């Protein structure tokens, strides 16, 4: 019981930190709102 509890809490903490980091990685491209030349990344506007 204690081990399943602690492993689940560790994993979910990792998950939230993941989402944090991911939106932080999102934050850069807000340059593009200028609507100008592309810089060849994973997301697309061809």
């Amino acid at each position: 019981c204690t081990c399943v509890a602690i492993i689940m809490v560790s994993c979910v903490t990792s998950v939230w930190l993941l989402c944090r980091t991911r939106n932080l990685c999102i934050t850069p491209y807000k340059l593009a709102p200028n609507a100008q030349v592309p810089i060849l990344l994973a997301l697309l506007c061809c």
Partner: protein, 151 residues
Amino acid sequence: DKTFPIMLNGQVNGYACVVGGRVFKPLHVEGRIDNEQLAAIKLKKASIYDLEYGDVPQCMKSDTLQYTSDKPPGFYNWHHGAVQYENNRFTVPRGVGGKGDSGRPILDNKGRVVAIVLGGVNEGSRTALSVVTWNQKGVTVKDTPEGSEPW
């Protein structure tokens, strides 16, 4: 694109507009929108700038120019008028109140709009200032005159 004021308790906090779609929505300070009819919509944010993204309506097509970063020291107009300096920001004179004056764009004499204010009023008799513009590579240059007077 009219300089739609932001009525901060009756102010004009941001006399903002849309330079071809994306509106100069400043999350900088405040203000009840002028074109709240148009501005009934919500917007993005800008952490590096305390701003927001307009992406104006299709009905709102033909909004304003978005002149490129190509600029020498040239008199770009504003509410306070025009001023011509490039290395240091535009050669306005000390004596204009940047606080509240946020929302003045780089109204370059060629009908060119490439920048808008950010702060940093003056120490000498001239007034170069902090702005937001396109960078050397055209990147979203967020100009920060070191030791910036708020707006």
